[PDB]
Scaffold this active site. Sequence first.
Site, PDB file in Angstrom:
ATOM      1  N   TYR A  37      -0.536   8.596  24.950  1.00 23.21           N
ATOM      2  CA  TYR A  37      -1.618   8.568  23.994  1.00 23.21           C
ATOM      3  C   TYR A  37      -1.939   9.950  23.431  1.00 23.21           C
ATOM      4  O   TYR A  37      -1.514  10.995  23.941  1.00 23.21           O
ATOM      5  CB  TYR A  37      -2.872   8.049  24.675  1.00 23.21           C
ATOM      6  CG  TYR A  37      -3.442   9.038  25.677  1.00 23.21           C
ATOM      7  CD1 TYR A  37      -4.476   9.906  25.318  1.00 23.21           C
ATOM      8  CD2 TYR A  37      -2.919   9.145  26.978  1.00 23.21           C
ATOM      9  CE1 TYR A  37      -4.969  10.849  26.212  1.00 23.21           C
ATOM     10  CE2 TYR A  37      -3.404  10.082  27.879  1.00 23.21           C
ATOM     11  CZ  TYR A  37      -4.430  10.941  27.489  1.00 23.21           C
ATOM     12  OH  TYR A  37      -4.883  11.936  28.339  1.00 23.21           O
ATOM     13  N   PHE A  47      -7.956  16.369  20.622  1.00 22.70           N
ATOM     14  CA  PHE A  47      -8.510  16.975  21.836  1.00 22.70           C
ATOM     15  C   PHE A  47      -7.711  16.678  23.087  1.00 22.70           C
ATOM     16  O   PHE A  47      -8.047  17.183  24.160  1.00 22.70           O
ATOM     17  CB  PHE A  47      -9.927  16.510  22.059  1.00 22.70           C
ATOM     18  CG  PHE A  47     -10.053  15.032  22.134  1.00 22.70           C
ATOM     19  CD1 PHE A  47     -10.352  14.293  20.990  1.00 22.70           C
ATOM     20  CD2 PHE A  47      -9.895  14.372  23.346  1.00 22.70           C
ATOM     21  CE1 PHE A  47     -10.504  12.917  21.053  1.00 22.70           C
ATOM     22  CE2 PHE A  47     -10.043  12.998  23.418  1.00 22.70           C
ATOM     23  CZ  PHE A  47     -10.349  12.266  22.276  1.00 22.70           C
ATOM     24  N   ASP A  48      -6.665  15.868  22.958  1.00 19.13           N
ATOM     25  CA  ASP A  48      -5.851  15.523  24.115  1.00 19.13           C
ATOM     26  C   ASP A  48      -4.655  14.634  23.756  1.00 19.13           C
ATOM     27  O   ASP A  48      -4.650  13.914  22.754  1.00 19.13           O
ATOM     28  CB  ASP A  48      -6.748  14.836  25.170  1.00 19.13           C
ATOM     29  CG  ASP A  48      -6.056  14.641  26.517  1.00 19.13           C
ATOM     30  OD1 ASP A  48      -5.410  15.592  27.024  1.00 19.13           O
ATOM     31  OD2 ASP A  48      -6.178  13.527  27.085  1.00 19.13           O
ATOM     32  N   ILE A  67     -12.226   5.032  29.975  1.00 22.99           N
ATOM     33  CA  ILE A  67     -13.372   4.615  29.185  1.00 22.99           C
ATOM     34  C   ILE A  67     -13.194   3.164  28.857  1.00 22.99           C
ATOM     35  O   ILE A  67     -12.068   2.637  28.836  1.00 22.99           O
ATOM     36  CB  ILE A  67     -13.532   5.408  27.810  1.00 22.99           C
ATOM     37  CG1 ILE A  67     -12.303   5.175  26.933  1.00 22.99           C
ATOM     38  CG2 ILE A  67     -13.814   6.919  28.063  1.00 22.99           C
ATOM     39  CD1 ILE A  67     -12.362   5.878  25.558  1.00 22.99           C
TER      40      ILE A  67
END
Length: 237
Positions: A37, A47-48, A67
């Site tokens: 991902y 951000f990742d 999440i």
Amino acid sequence: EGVDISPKQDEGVLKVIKREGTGTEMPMIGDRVFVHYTGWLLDGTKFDSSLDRKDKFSFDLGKGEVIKAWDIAIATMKVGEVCHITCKPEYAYGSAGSPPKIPPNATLVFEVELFEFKGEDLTEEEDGGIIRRIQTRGEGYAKPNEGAIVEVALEGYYKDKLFDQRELRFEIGEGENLDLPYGLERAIQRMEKGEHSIVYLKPSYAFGSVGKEKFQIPPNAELKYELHLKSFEKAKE
């Protein structure tokens, strides 16, 4: 412009399929899943990503290990599938946000590719001897303990041939005398009231070297059971 896949349908999780996957199966709660991902804020700030990772990112589904939007989305995916999901803060990190990288009340976008998924290993040694694939989650949270009186409906298969089909009430710890393998009892101890599951038992968690002559089951046989835990009463301790 994706499809809303939030249970409440509150547009909290929108999904757009980029590449269709194969087959018809989709992971279910408890299955171990493997994906790659990349995550971005709504403005495009990455951000990742796990795309640098030597290996896929994996977790057990529907166990809150990720999440909410993820537990929700991945259960709607097929192997090979690549999708993008926009998640409202309620299904992500909400008000609290997540320091440096993610501000409070942030809507997030993830690109997710599902590579593989497998049943949950229920053995204490994690040797793949008892694997469960939940068909329909129960609803109760409580589970039978040693000594509990359980009510189950079961169908057992050996090389996909049905050899046992019964509805019975019995005490966990006493299944042996009713021709149930120890591993099945152990699996029942991990089920919730109302759960419908398929459990795969390797020989050592089945009838092992003895087999079960009256069921036409020889020594060292793998078995598969589809069962329903209807109700139960826990024993004292």
